[PDB]
Structure formats: C-alpha cells, structure tokens
Amino acid sequence: PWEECFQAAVQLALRAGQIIRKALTEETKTSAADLVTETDHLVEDLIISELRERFPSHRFIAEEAKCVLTHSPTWIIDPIDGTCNFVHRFPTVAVSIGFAVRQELEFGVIYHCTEERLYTGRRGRGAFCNGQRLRVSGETDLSKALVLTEIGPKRDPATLKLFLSNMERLLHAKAHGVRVIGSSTLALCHLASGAADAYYQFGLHCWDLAAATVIIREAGGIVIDTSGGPLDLMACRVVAASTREMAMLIAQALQTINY
C-alpha cells in the first residue's frame, strides 16, 4: 500500500473539501443541521467508494460506515471533523482520511476546507502542509506551553466535573494557554506544525487521531496514551505533545475518564 493510495487520498480530500466549502454558503436553525449531515453523507460516500473503486480489497472505517482494524490495508476516515462548527458556519471544519497497513499507520491527509490548508504526512518521509515542511514545536516546559483540547458530547454531570478539573491542572501549572477550536483534527495538525505544543482528549475516536498521528510523528512530535508509553488507537483518548518529555509531563498531571 503506497502512493496510488496517497495521490488518491489527497485528490479526494481536496474535492471532499471543496464540495464542503461551497456548502457553507448557506442560508435556518435546523435546516442547516441537515445540510451538514447531507454533506457528511455526501463526502463519506465520495471517499469510501472512489477509494473502493480503486483497490476494491482495502477495508474502511468512518463516523457513519465499530472501530476494529485488521491487518488488512484499512482506510480510517472522518468525512467531516467539526460538524458542530459547520452547523454554525464556523470557519474550522476538516476532512481527514488516514491509511494504515499491517495494522499500523502509513500515512494521512487532513484538510482545512475554509483556510485551504492541506496537512499530509507519510511514514519515513515526514509531514507537510501545502508543500511546506512541518516540524513539531520542540518545547518541553508546560510553563511555556499552549495546550489544545476539545469538549466531548457526553453532557453528563459525572463527565464534566472531570473535564473541568482536568483543564485546571494544566492551568494550575504555568501553561500559557488552552484552546478549544472545536476540531480534534486541526488541533492535532496545529500541534504538528508548531502552532501548539500539546493536545489531549477523552471521548475521542480512532478516525480522529488516525491521520494526525502519522503527521504529528513525521513532524517530530509524539503521540501516546493518557497513561503513558503506548498509544491505544481502539481506545478513545490521546496525548500528543511537542516533545517526549512534554508528553509524559501532561500525563503525570491528568486524570482519566472515557466510554
């Protein structure tokens, strides 16, 4: 699984990013809410069929069509990351399609519909954005860290107490700031470029960190589990920072909550 798969993933991510950019020229409280899903369904189909059309033997995964990845060359996608922003015409929605082989990430392309920024990255060839070599921040002290993270959908009194208590711990240290742009993909992408030093989230999904990861890594950064050491994709949490140190750091300063 090589390049004919990459040149495609990007070609489709581009179309799948345009058809969606033109969508935001909308006009309404709930009518839009549908336009979106209709779009989400329009994108997902586009990608998981044109890619099916070529390489008719590869597996797929996405928000609509469990996250069980076999050793087969499987394509992990999130047709539209940031449907809530999209509903409000908030300029930050992405379409990410990641590709794994032998049960490990080989590459991934994340697109920025509005800002037309295109993040890509293969393994053994580094990460780029609109053909410009990306390299992870390179920071290590939280006191000089800009953390990224998003709120989950689980609006349960249990959940929230932890999410907030968790923000606090990072703020309690001297982390410059916390950002909640409302998009996991772009957040991870920002980290990859260096616009962010760390990121974290529980209630996240496999199709979110599938592409970013490849990029964040070939960029230099590191992506692991809220605990430490390894990174469990079929789990629903992640911890990727600017350095191997920072990562461990944002860990021994974080409490767990998921599923």
Add this chain to the structure above:
Amino acid sequence: PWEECFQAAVQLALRAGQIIRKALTEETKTSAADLVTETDHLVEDLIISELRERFPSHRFIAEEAKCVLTHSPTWIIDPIDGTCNFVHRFPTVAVSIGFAVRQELEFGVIYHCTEERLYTGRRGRGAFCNGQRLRVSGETDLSKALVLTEIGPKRDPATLKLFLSNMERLLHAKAHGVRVIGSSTLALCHLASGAADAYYQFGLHCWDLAAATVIIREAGGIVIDTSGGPLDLMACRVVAASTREMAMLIAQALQTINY
C-alpha cells in the same frame, strides 16, 4: 468625526495587518516572544501617529500607550489582539482600532492578519467583512448555542475556580459548545457574522470590545454587562449574544469576578 477617519483606520489596519502577517514567518523559545512585542510596538506606533498626523487633536488609548475616555473624539486601539497565539505562530491574531465620539462608539475595524478577513462597521450603516453584509445569528435558546470566551491572564486560585464553575453552567444547560480561540476581537467578530451565538469574558479590556461592539450591534446582536441592561466600557467584562433574549439568558446563568 466621519470617514476620513474611517478610510484611514482601515488603511492602517491593513498595513498594520500585513507587517504583522510577514512577521509570522519567524524562526527560538523567547526570541519570538520579543519579535512579537517589537511588532506590537511597531504596529501601535504606526497607527497612533499616522492617525495623530491627521486629526492632530483626537485622543488615543491602547495596550501600551489608564482607559479614561473623554467626550473628545477618542481612538480606542489594540495594536495586536492575541499576542500569545502570535508567539506560537497560531493563525489567529487581530489588530483592532475603534473610534468613539461624544463618548460613544461611532465605528470600528478589526482585522484578521492570517485569514485576511476584514471586519468593519459604522453606526447607522451596519457591519461588513470583506464587503459582505454581516448579520447576527438570530438564535435565542442556549440549547442551540455555540458560546465563545477566553481565559484571562490572572492565574490565581481564586480566579480559576470561578472561570471553570462558570464554563460549567453554560455547559450544564444544553449549549452546543464552547470555544477558546485565544482572541477576544475575532471571537466578538465571529459572533457578529453569525459563526457564534454568544460571548463572555471577565478581565477583558476597553480596547478589546470597543470596535467589535459597533460591529456586533450594526450586525444585529446585542452587547451588555455581565449583570444586564447597560454596558460599562471602563469596566472589564462583557456579554454580547445573538439576541437580546440570549444575552439576558447567558446572564441569569453567570457569576461575577474581575479586577
């Protein structure tokens, strides 16, 4: 105080947005931190002197050079809103210059250096962004609301308990989501366009909501005090939403903390 003042404010906001966009092509932990301030000082000077050059009798206010506004036609500016993001090369930093006469806001232009979006708005002529008529969301039920807000600099155990407890209340209702892009100006601008329904912040400053307000209002939205009714500019808090209802709503669901 009319247009020769507006055509200028925009002309300078444009230059003052370019000289700053070219700045972000930087290369470092603290060297950048200076580049920024140097920039901030370079912008502020640009604007409060070219504007001084013309209309040598108007007053000024900005982050560097108390917030005491007389009835004189005073120019309220924030040469660079989002210096922390800028330090990290985070694509969301704005330069806002607002103009008040007879001690009330007449107009204001907020620029988006990276995304090249230009928000303007005079009083009695509505608000625009890159010549496209803007109109406030028009929402009223928090259950379908995308709230915007930023963390302050005051890293004091007192503060934080309130900030977080405050987020929670909005999340406890069924507000779609909360965003912390790291820029008051752009946040208020998003609200004005309709990409956001509400906004709130304590520890804010007069030069932040000076221009936005004009825009948010001529856009349709409403900007008031964390309490209600009136809006105290020389205070350090604000509450502007998509509708007069929403506003009151985000109020009777919010606790105060400032200075």
